[PDB]
RNA sequence: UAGCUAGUAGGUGGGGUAACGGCUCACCUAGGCGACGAUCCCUAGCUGGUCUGAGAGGAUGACCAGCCACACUGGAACUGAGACACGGUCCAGACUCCUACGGGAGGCAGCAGUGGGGAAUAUUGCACAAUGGGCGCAAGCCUGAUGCAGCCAUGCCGCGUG
RNA sequence: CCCGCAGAAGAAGCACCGGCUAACUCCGUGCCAGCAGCCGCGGUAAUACGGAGGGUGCAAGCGUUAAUCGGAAUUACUGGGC
């Protein structure tokens, strides 16, 4: 449930620190964003010499949610903080080089193979 | 972690384990002494001192500690002993 | 896009709009006059060369040279 | 004067500033020549000296003279700059080493050919 | 840049170092520094020297040698005669690359070299033949220290193009 | 390093030439193009520009631009002024 106006941490080293979800991509009047869901965000705060400056607008894929995905059996994984990985706005292609924090298996899709490799856990 | 001579990591950490054990032993005997000393009996004080003198002196001779450390320990501990009585 | 509402009647605002549009274009499309460069005047060049030559004369007779006297 | 006054507040050395700041103690600096045109000298010399406006590899955008008769310096030519005032155009405190870095030498300068960067007529 | 300082400045005691020492701790006192410039800010490795100069001085610290400091950044110890350690340990960190996805691994400010920077600077060389260096009783091995050559009119010096 | 080399034999450029600073003529250009360390040269005989000839000077180098000290007694203590 990463909807509009949701401030997100950055689970990689792109440069941002908090980014506001400004639109949930995919479908009309779609409200929320699970883990694998891509969102449109803007950088509400970036570190000084980051790869992206504050104010930019670009896509991002969620990787950690306070809500938590339910596994096929009924097991849930509720992180403590919503955080996403930045993506290029034309190619998916995450911007950052490293990736912090854990991730899940709902990320184990084609375009996010790079993310799931760089990611350390799950 | 480049050359051979990083056997030295083992050759040094094994020594550190043994050395820490020995230092803990030494200063536990010295703390026994100090406990006797603050307790209030030159009897127990000198008791611990006798049973600790070979310990500290041997650990000094073993190159673990330096002999001046045993010196200062024996000195001020004898001093505390005699001021208590 | 133009919003014309100052008058009290749509038949008046409907020409206020067209007036605003044509008056906009007539100056947003102007071809401002092109400023060609200007060259120093003949008399100014003559005064420059005059001063230059008088300075040349004084600076020439101001010096030291053994043309005549060996 | 007044050895006591000198003792209290001593005499000093006026640090003589450099008349080629963009060189900052470097013999030469390359530039991109963001402009290239002609400009008329000051009062007496009544001519059109060829000048350029360059952006060096040390951020110092400077106006630089263009030596010789004729050249092929353009908007994006990697050039090389030495010191030396023009004494004529107020503001030009530098030059260009002709005959290196895209700059051509004057046409077959027989004299001053080490300057103006022209190869020799092999004889 | 006119005030700064509170473990601060001392005292006593306890502790601690190889060693005295607020080194550290607990008390007692109000110290303690500061126009002879404290403090704060900018700059900088220091010296023998070097260049200039008549001399004082001015600029200065590339080579060689003496001393200090640092080892990707931050911190810490360990072992040790000696390190809080260039080619060791642990943690953290940014970066980068691997993977039997659990884990890792790395630190050219050594030589050579690459990319990059620049106006600008050289071989991914040879020998351990002397020298020194460590190891070893020693022979003998290791040594990109060195000794040599590679390259550049980069300086000084000498001879030729008659 | 040392003994034969049959043949000059494969081997001089660079700057300057108005004054400071030394070393001069012609040509072409004619405020143009250009030169310039400072003063400055250039409007038709230009010793200053470009070329040729010639001269001056250094030479396996020659100059240009850094950069420092000197001259600079222009931070003066030696060794200055009001
Ligand atoms: Mg004490
Ligand atoms: Mg580095
Ligand atoms: Mg290294
Ligand atoms: Mg070896
Ligand atoms: Mg001439
Ligand atoms: Mg005076």
Swiss-Prot record, chain A:
Its Gene Ontology cellular component terms are:
cytoplasm; cytosol; cytosolic large ribosomal subunit
Listed GO molecular functions? Answer: large ribosomal subunit rRNA binding; structural constituent of ribosome
Matching entries from CDD domains are given as: Ribosomal_uL14 (cd00337)
Q: InterPro entries under this entry?
A: Ribosomal_uL14, Ribosomal_uL14_bac-type, Ribosomal_uL14_CS, Ribosomal_uL14_sf
Source superkingdom: Bacteria
Q: What Pfam families does the record tag this protein with? A: Ribosomal_L14 (PF00238)
User: What stretch or stretches form a coiled coil here?
Assistant: none
Any one biological process term the GO annotation gives: cytoplasmic translation
Give the UniProt keywords, A-Z. Answer: Ribonucleoprotein, Ribosomal protein, RNA-binding, rRNA-binding
Q: Does the keyword DNA damage apply?
A: no
Role noted for this protein: Binds to 23S rRNA. Forms part of two intersubunit bridges in the 70S ribosome. In the 3.5 A resolved structures L14 and L19 interact and together make contact with the 16S rRNA in bridges B5 and B8.
Oligomeric state and partners? Answer: Part of the 50S ribosomal subunit. Forms a cluster with proteins L3 and L19. Forms two bridges to the 30S subunit in the 70S ribosome, contacting the 16S rRNA. In pre-50S ribosomal subunits interacts with RsfS, which may inhibit association with the 30S subunit.
* Family affiliation: Belongs to the universal ribosomal protein uL14 family.
Q: Which NCBIfam families match?
A: rplN_bact
Q: What is this protein called?
A: Large ribosomal subunit protein uL14
Q: Which organism is it from?
A: Escherichia coli (strain K12)
Q: Give the classification, highest ranks.
A: Bacteria, Pseudomonadati, Pseudomonadota, Gammaproteobacteria, Enterobacterales
